[PDB]
Every structure is written in C-alpha cells, then in structure tokens.
Design a protein around this ligand. Structure first.
Ligand SMILES: OC[C@H]1O[C@H](O[C@H]2[C@H](O)[C@@H](O)[C@@H](O[C@H]3[C@H](O)[C@@H](O)[C@@H](O[C@H]4[C@H](O)[C@@H](O)[C@@H](O[C@H]5[C@H](O)[C@@H](O)[C@@H](O[C@H]6[C@H](O)[C@@H](O)[C@@H](O[C@H]7[C@H](O)[C@@H](O)[C@@H](O[C@H]8[C@H](O)[C@@H](O)[C@@H](O[C@H]9[C@H](O)[C@@H](O)[C@@H](O[C@H]%10[C@H](O)[C@@H](O)[C@@H](O[C@H]%11[C@H](O)[C@@H](O)[C@@H](O[C@H]%12[C@H](O)[C@@H](O)[C@@H](O)O[C@@H]%12CO)O[C@@H]%11CO)O[C@@H]%10CO)O[C@@H]9CO)O[C@@H]8CO)O[C@@H]7CO)O[C@@H]6CO)O[C@@H]5CO)O[C@@H]4CO)O[C@@H]3CO)O[C@@H]2CO)[C@H](O)[C@@H](O)[C@@H]1O
Ligand SMILES: OC[C@H]1O[C@H](O[C@H]2[C@H](O)[C@@H](O)[C@@H](O[C@H]3[C@H](O)[C@@H](O)[C@@H](O[C@H]4[C@H](O)[C@@H](O)[C@@H](O[C@H]5[C@H](O)[C@@H](O)[C@@H](O[C@H]6[C@H](O)[C@@H](O)[C@@H](O[C@H]7[C@H](O)[C@@H](O)[C@@H](O[C@H]8[C@H](O)[C@@H](O)[C@@H](O[C@H]9[C@H](O)[C@@H](O)[C@@H](O)O[C@@H]9CO)O[C@@H]8CO)O[C@@H]7CO)O[C@@H]6CO)O[C@@H]5CO)O[C@@H]4CO)O[C@@H]3CO)O[C@@H]2CO)[C@H](O)[C@@H](O)[C@@H]1O
Ligand SMILES: [Ca+2]
Ligand SMILES: [Ca+2]
Ligand SMILES: [Ca+2]
Ligand code: NA
Length: 531
C-alpha cells in the first residue's frame, strides 16, 4: 500500500498569506498533488505546497495527493484547509475612566458596534428569550481561563466568562452573564470538569459586578469599617481578608470604579452586599465602606429571598450561536495565544459544543441601590465589569483584562497542578463596558477602509485556466471602484468586484487591487500567483 500524506493537521485554519504544507510518501519513489483541481504535479518526499498562496481570505483550499504502489493500486488522499481573513474593528476609549491599557481586541470587544445595552424590562427567570446579541456590552472568548496554561489543570472546574449583556428600565439594571465549558472537546479524559461537577453553583464562589457611577472617583479595592467598639480597620479588598491581610490575593482597580456588587455563584452567601466607595483615603482614592453596605444576600438559600430587591437566577444554557476560542490540548498553549490570530481559533459549535455545556446568570440590581435613575443611565451612563474568581483572586473578567493571565502558568502554592492566578494580586487597567452613554471625552479609533483580495483558485493553476480575482470591502464609505492589476498593469477598473484573468504563459505573477470608496479613501492588496 503506497500513499502520499502530510503531517500538517487536516482542516487547519491559517491567517497567513500561505501555509507551507510538507508532503511525504510511503512505499513510492514519486507522487502527484492537485491543489484546487490544478493539473497533477509530481512531488518527491520533502517537497511542499504553498496552500492559500494568491487566494482571497475566507476560502477553502483542497489538496489531493496521488500515489501508485508496486501492485498498481491507485491511492488518493484529499485534505481541506481554510485561509481566514479578519477585518480590524472600530474601538474607543476615554482618558477620564483612569484606564492605562487599551481594550483587548481581536476576538475580544468592549461595547462592540457601540452596543451600550437597551431600555428593556427583563424577567430574571433563566429563560434567554428576553436577550439578544445586540445587547452584548463585553465580548470575551472561551478557553482563556487560567487553568488552560498549566501543564495539566483541565481536571479543575472552569471559570470561563464568555459574554456580558445589559439592559435597564425605570426600576432595575439587568445583566446576562454567559460562561462556557469546552473541557468536553479539549480534554474529555479530565472527566471532573467534563461533567455536572463543573456547574458554578457546586460551591459558594465570589462573583462581582464592578460599577462606575461617578466616573471621577477611583476606588483601589481597599475597604474600611468600624468594630463594635468604634475602632477603624481596613482591608486591601472587601472580601478574602483575615487580620487585615489577603493571604490568597484579590482584585484591585486602576480603572475608575466606585461601586462593587459582591455576590456568589450559588446565591447562598448571606453576606452578599453592594459596597459604595464613600470614604476618601489620605491618597485621594475612595475606600469601600463595610458600615454603609447594602445587604443583597438571601435570608434562606432554599427560599432564594435576596434582600433589597436584588434578583439572581442561574441555569445550564447558551445564548450565543457561536462560541469562539482556542481548540488545543493541555501542553499546547502559548503565552498570549488568546490575543494572537495565529492560534487555533474555532467556533466550538463546529467541534461538537452543546447549549447544555454552558452556564447563564440573569441579574437585577435595583437603581435605588445605585443612587441613580433611568435618566442618569441614558444621559450620563455608567461603567461595568463582571469578575469571576475561584475564591479570592480574579480568574476571568468581561471586559477581559491581561492581569487575569499574567501569572496563569505559575504553580498554585497549595497544589502545584493548578494556577497561581487563584491566589495572586490582579489590578484592572482596561476600560469598563459603558451602559446607556459614552463618557464625554471618548476618542474613537475608526477602523480604516481595507480590502480582502485574491484568486478563487490556489497559486499553481495551469496556463489557460480562467482565474477569478475577487475583492471584498470593509469599513468603506459609499460605493467602491476596483482597479484589478496583473504585474502592475490595470486589466479592469469599474464598480464590479471580480475580474476573470486567464494567464496564457507560465511565470510568477503579482495580482493586485486598488479600491477607492465614495470619499476617495484607498485600500490596496498585492499577492503572488505562480503558473
Ligand atoms: O460582605 C460583608 C462581609 O465581608 C467579609 O466576609 C466575606 C468574606 O471576606 C468572603 O471571602 C466570603 O466568604 C465566604 C466564602 O466565599 C464561601 O465560599 C464560604 O466559605 C467558607 C467555607 O464554606 C467553609 O467551609 C470554611 O472553609 C475553611 C475550611 O472549613 C477549612 O478546613 C480550611 O480549609 C483548608 C483545607 O482543609 C486544606 O486542605 C487546604 O485546602 C487546599 C488543598 O489542600 C489543595 O489541594 C487545594 O485544593 C483545591 C484544588 O486546587 C482545586 O482544584 C479543587 O480540587 C478538586 C479538583 O479540581 C477536582 O478535579 C477533583 O479532583 C479529583 C479528580 O478530578 C479525580 O480524577 C481524582 O483524582 C485522582 C485520580 O483519578 C487518580 O488517577 C490519581 O492520579 C495520579 C496518577 O495516578 C499519577 O500517575 C500521577 O499522574 O499523579 C496523579 C495525581 O496525584 O490520584 C488523583 C488524586 O490525587 O480525585 C480528585 C479528588 O481527590 O476534586 C478536587 C477536590 O474538590 O479544590 C481543592 C479544594 O479547595 O487548595 C485548597 C485550598 O487552598 O486549605 C484550605 C484553606 O485553608 O479553611 C477554609 C477557609 O477558611 O470557611 C470558608 C470561609 O469562611 O463562606 C464564606 C463566609 O460567608 O463572603 C463573606 C461574607 O459572607 C467580611 O469578613 C465580613 O466581616 C463582612 O461582614
Ligand atoms: O472565598 C473565600 C475562600 O477562598 C478560598 O477558598 C476556595 C478554595 O480555594 C477553592 O478551591 C474552592 O474550594 C471548593 C472546592 O473547589 C470544591 O471542590 C469543594 O472541595 C471539597 C470537596 O468537594 C470534598 O470532597 C473534600 O475534598 C477532599 C477530596 O474528596 C479528597 O479526595 C482529597 O483530595 C486531595 C487528594 O487526596 C490529593 O491527592 C490531591 O489531589 C490532587 C493531585 O495532587 C494533583 O496533582 C491533581 O491531580 C491531577 C493531575 O495533576 C493531572 O495531571 C491529571 O492527571 C491525569 C493525567 O493528565 C492523565 O494523563 C492520566 O495520567 O490520568 C491522570 C489522572 O489519573 O489529573 C489529576 C486529577 O485527576 O489534582 C488532584 C485533585 O485536587 O489533593 C486533593 C485535594 O485538592 O482531599 C480533599 C480535601 O482536602 O473537601 C473539599 C474542601 O476542602 O469545596 C470547596 C469549598 O468548600 O472554593 C473555596 C471557597 O471557599 C480560600 O482557600 C479560603 O481560604 C477563603 O476563605
Ligand atoms: Ca473566557
Ligand atoms: Ca494575575
Ligand atoms: Ca488572579
Ligand atoms: Na429571562
């Protein structure tokens, strides 16, 4: 049995102009390959194919390898690869929120497409029909929680935030939190996390909504209270401290917040509270006050009777129809892969994800516990971030903050199989997600006009093959005129976004487009095509 093969994984997606695919042979001196139906071309062991070369992004490449054994049996193996294109997207930030790190982008987004939430009455009932994708104020990714960066921590329950949605009405501020669990796909041998034991309500784990009502106030996370005898004490964080120290860390804030909704994954924490940073420290920052906190905890776990009109309901389920994240086994992660387009990004729904794998929290915070009304939300706006923990320190946030992963691959002091992110000091520096209205000093970074350009067939087609040059416009103003070029010469200049090129002779060609929109903005792309 003779056959051609590649060590390159089948259905690899690549963001580069090409993927240098290594060809090998078993029990044959020679073989042949066909790329996008090209005329068969001889290959010896070690030869390579520039899969995707000359092609437009978001196209499939088919590679067929042909071998004949001594027996005369003819063998064919067909691989498929995906060349991907991702447009840049508009971002914005305001210096007045105290942020020192730009919002994370790529698969992450803060207020994507300027979504600031909607005026809508939500039912806190675990039914997701109240929500839709247009209400997302913070987009995260799946499988970027700290355990993924350890050699073998996939046995540990995930703390994997996916998306945060918001609404408001006359009475309440509403949130939907989606959490993902991709353990079933990436690491099924780690049964504990690929089971009902992954449910976030298995135990009482702190969760937070960090809010900015007055954008000028900076609360570092430090807390102040008085004992029964009136003596003043301080803690570096509202929660997780004993004798004025945080032995297992916590989450602090550079980005401006003044309100902290401290609740729990089980809704069994009777001490759940809305803290206000109402006391100025010597450094001009504000401290969360134990003495003025608004109780929002249950009287009885069984009754789920939260105080002061706070509502929370959790369930299995998924609202998003796509779950984007990196599909890789334990030991095949890279420092910062969550911010890198070269990573093995998938929609996990294409890899066997089920709605029932995910978890949802619906939340109502009464406006009268935040000292605001609907007019304030729609005129001034507020800022929000969701924080997940596994007891003390942050693990994942929406919007996502790089302090969640800066020590992800270091060992947990009590159990070195798991992540130091469970016990370290995090500090938030990215913008909060805006609700209702943008800060007045907002600067918009508009995504410039760009094109996705290339051939409908892989480089290496035969002379006389009709090749369709294709162009796609992103962030264009009005109608676009496409000037298609071969070897620097204009072959077509018109409104039409495709052009048939039939090369008569062999050679290396440059193919290009120059696109001009209705305001004279220019986008260009030049690629190589070999005949
Ligand atoms: O508002 C106003 C207010 O404010 C404030 O207050 C507040 C505060 O502040 C806050 O904070 C809050 O609080 C709250 C909270 O939150 C809640 O939560 C609650 O709490 C509480 C509780 O409840 C109670 O209970 C208490 O606690 C305590 C206790 O009691 C005591 O005891 C202590 O503890 C301790 C302990 O004891 C010790 O032990 C420690 O621990 C530790 C340990 O040690 C370590 O280890 C760790 O662990 C951990 C880990 O890491 C993780 O991961 C986990 O685990 C798990 C896992 O994950 C899973 O997976 C499982 O596993 C399993 C698996 O899966 C399976 O598979 C198995 O395995 C096995 C296998 O199969 C076999 O095959 C083997 O293997 C082997 C092989 O064969 C070879 O070949 C090699 O390869 O190797 C391998 C390995 O070896 O074998 C294996 C085995 O080994 O199985 C397994 C099992 O075994 O599962 C697991 C388990 O689960 O988890 C763990 C655990 O965690 O770490 C740890 C930790 O660190 O230590 C501890 C600590 O110290 O202590 C504690 C503490 O204290 O208490 C608490 C507190 O309190 O509640 C609270 C209250 O409420 O909130 C508040 C309010 O309310 C202020 O203050 C005030 O004034 C105001 O008013
Ligand atoms: O909020 C304020 C608060 O914050 C903080 O508290 C929080 C905690 O920090 C946080 O963890 C959380 O706690 C809750 C727990 O999450 C929750 O689970 C629950 O815990 C209960 C248990 O439910 C209860 O049963 C009991 O637990 C017992 C166990 O039953 C018992 O078995 C025993 O477990 C220990 C083991 O005996 C011991 O060996 C060891 O096991 C480790 C192992 O050493 C480690 O290496 C690892 O193993 C991995 C391996 O590394 C990995 O490679 C892989 O291996 C596979 C390979 O990959 C494959 O190739 C192939 O070879 O196969 C192998 C497998 O064969 O997978 C392995 C696992 O399969 O992991 C092992 C498991 O951990 O350690 C075990 C314990 O860790 O003993 C425990 C009791 O000690 O009791 C616990 C409670 O104590 O409830 C918790 C909350 O109550 O949330 C907290 C919030 O309060 C702060 O800490 C706190 O101070 C603050 O106040
Ligand atoms: Ca996540
Ligand atoms: Ca950290
Ligand atoms: Ca952390
Ligand atoms: Na609902």
């Amino acid at each position: 049995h003779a056959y051609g093969y590649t060590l390159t994984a089948n259905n690899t997606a690549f963001s580069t102009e090409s993927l240098d695919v290594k060809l090998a042979l078993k029990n044959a001196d020679k073989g042949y390959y066909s790329v996008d139906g090209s005329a068969k071309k001889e290959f010896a062991n070690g030869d390579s194919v520039k899969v995707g070369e000359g092609k437009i992004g978001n196209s499939k490449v088919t590679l067929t390898l042909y071998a004949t054994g001594a027996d005369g049996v003819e063998t064919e193996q067909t691989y498929t690869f995906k060349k991907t294109f991702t447009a840049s997207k508009t971002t914005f930030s305001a210096k007045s929120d105290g942020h020192t790190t730009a919002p994370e982008s790529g698969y992450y987004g803060t207020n994507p497409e300027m979504q600031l939430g909607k005026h809508k009455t939500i039912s806190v009932d675990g039914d997701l029909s109240d929500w839709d994708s247009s209400m997302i104020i913070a987009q995260g990714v799946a499988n970027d929680d700290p355990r993924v960066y350890m050699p073998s921590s996939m046995h540990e329950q995930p703390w994997d935030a996916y998306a945060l949605y918001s609404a408001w009405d006359d009475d309440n501020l509403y949130f939907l939190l989606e959490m993902a669990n991709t353990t079933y796909i990436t690491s099924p041998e780690d049964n504990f996390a690929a089971s009902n034991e992954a449910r976030p309500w298995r135990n009482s784990i702190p969760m937070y909504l960090a809010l900015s009502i007055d954008p000028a106030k900076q609360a570092t996370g430090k807390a102040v209270g008085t004992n029964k005898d009136g003596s003043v004490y301080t803690n570096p964080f509202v929660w997780g401290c004993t004798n004025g120290t945080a032995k297992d860390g916590g989450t602090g804030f550079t980005t401006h917040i003044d309100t902290l909704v401290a609740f729990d994954s089980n809704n069994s924490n009777g001490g759940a509270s809305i803290f206000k940073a109402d006391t100025q420290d010597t450094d001009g920052t504000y401290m969360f006050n134990y003495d003025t906190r608004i109780p929002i905890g249950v009287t009885s776990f069984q009754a789920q009777d939260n105080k002061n009109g706070f509502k929370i309901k959790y369930a299995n389920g998924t609202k998003s129809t796509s779950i984007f994240g990196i599909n890789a086994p334990k030991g095949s992660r890279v420092m910062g892969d969550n911010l890198d387009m070269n990573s093995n990004w998938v929609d996990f729904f294409d890899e066997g994800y089920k709605n029932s794998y995910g978890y949802v929290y619906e939340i109502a915070v009464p406006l009268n516990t935040l000292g605001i009304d609907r007019s304030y939300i729609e005129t001034q706006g507020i800022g929000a971030m969701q924080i997940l923990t596994y007891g003390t320190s942050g693990m994942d946030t929406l919007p996502h903050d790089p302090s969640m992963l800066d020590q992800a691959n270091l060992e947990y002091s009590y159990d070195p199989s798991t992540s130091h992110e469970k016990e370290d000091i995090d500090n938030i520096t990215v913008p909060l997600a805006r609700i209702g209205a943008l800060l007045p000093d907002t600067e918009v970074n508009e995504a410039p006009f760009e094109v996705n350009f290339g051939a409908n067939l892989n480089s290496g087609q035969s002379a006389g093959t009709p090749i369709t040059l294709l162009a796609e416009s992103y962030h264009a103003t009005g109608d676009v005129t496409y000037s298609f070029t071969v070897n620097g010469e204009t072959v077509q200049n018109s409104n039409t976004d495709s052009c048939v090129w039939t090369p008569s002779a062999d050679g290396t060609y440059s193919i290009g487009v120059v696109a001009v929109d209705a305001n004279g903005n220019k986008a260009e792309s030049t690629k190589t095509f070999v005949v």
